[PDB]
């Protein structure tokens, strides 16, 4: 603390800089919520449960968070295997300019911090 | 210390023992998977 984090202003975190920041940061979650709500209202409780179970099972076999992963099965299930968005060609995450220590990020993923 | 900061009062020995025991009865993120291997003896 105070060295592993810094240059953070509380009064500059409550107010977003741009109208599009929050929508772009949380697009997938809102899309999933809309799809699940429509499916649950049309078919029943079982379909969103099955979809969430499949997503959770697939997302649990990846590399450790300090190395880039491919996410093939998740993209097959979601349907993003034949569409290219702005998240794929801009600011490639496979060539990030900053990265932390391995053990610290693995610990942070588990929530021990 | 939190109790004093909140109420301006000294905690009961029974109350502090209960607060301690509320943590060691849960097992099975940060919680352990095994029981604590220690026995305490409060007093005052």
């Amino acid at each position: 603390d105070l060295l592993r984090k810094g240059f953070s202003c509380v009064k500059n975190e409550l107010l977003p800089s741009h109208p599009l920041e929050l929508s772009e940061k949380n697009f997938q979650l809102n899309q999933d919520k809309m799809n699940f709500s429509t499916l649950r209202n049309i078919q029943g409780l079982f379909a969103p449960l099955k979809l969430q179970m499949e997503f959770k099972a697939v997302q649990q076999v990846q590399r450790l968070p300090f190395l880039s992963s491919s996410n093939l099965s998740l993209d097959v299930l979601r349907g993003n295997d034949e569409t290219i968005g702005f998240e794929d060609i801009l600011n490639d995450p496979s060539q990030s300019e900053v990265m932390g220590e391995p053990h610290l990020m693995v610990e942070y993923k588990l929530g021990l911090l | 210390q939190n109790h004093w900061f909140t109420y301006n009062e000294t905690m009961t020995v029974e109350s502090v023992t209960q607060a301690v025991s509320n943590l060691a009865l849960q097992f099975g993120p940060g919680a352990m998977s095994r029981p604590f291997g220690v026995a305490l003896l409060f007093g005052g």
Binding site: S17, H18, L20, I89, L90, N91, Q95, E97 | -
Partner: protein, 179 residues
């Protein structure tokens, strides 16, 4: 705050890139240069990030980079920050690593390119310096006359200037001021 001015021309197997009196022209490769104008900090950040990406590309693919690929890469880098943009206006001039053909272009702060055959200019003075350059340019000018023409245009449009002349064999760097 001035902004500066960056200018480019091409001739017979040679190109010329010039700027006014902070560093503005950065070498990217063996016979490929880039010039930026605008805020100093944005210039430095863009140059550093471009060097990072170019070094990774050259290491991974095991070959030198063509000018058009560099133009596309810098356009993508600039368009990444579409909503909050960098305040820079790049200019690229260089020769093909194998064919040895001239190439000059320009971009805006968002990344819209513009390939031109005779001359390229960008900076805080673009409305002027256009007609004079158009009247002062001739096709297929040899190195020394190219240097004379570009120095004359840069001095007449505006202290000192810096001129880079890059060829198939030698690279000439000169600094001069009006007498």
């Amino acid at each position: 705050y001035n902004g500066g001015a960056v200018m480019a021309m091409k001739g017979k197997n040679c190109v010329a890139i010039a700027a006014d009196r902070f560093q503005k022209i950065f070498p990217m490769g063996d016979r490929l240069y880039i010039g930026l104008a605008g805020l100093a900090t944005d210039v430095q950040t863009v140059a550093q990030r471009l060097k990072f990406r170019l070094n990774l590309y050259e290491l991974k693919e095991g070959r030198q980079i063509k000018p058009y690929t560099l133009m596309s890469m810098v356009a993508n880098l600039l368009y990444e920050k579409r909503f909050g943009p960098y305040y820079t206006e790049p200019v690229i001039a260089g020769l093909d690593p194998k064919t040895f053909k001239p190439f000059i272009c320009s971009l805006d702060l968002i990344g819209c390119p513009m390939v031109t055959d005779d001359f390229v200019v960008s900076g805080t003075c673009a409305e002027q310096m256009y007609g004079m350059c158009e009247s002062l340019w001739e096709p297929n000018m040899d190195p020394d006359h190219l240097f004379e023409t570009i120095s004359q245009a840069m001095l007449n449009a505006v202290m000192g200037v810096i001129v880079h002349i890059i060829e198939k064999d030698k690279i000439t760097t000169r600094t001069l001021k009006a007498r």
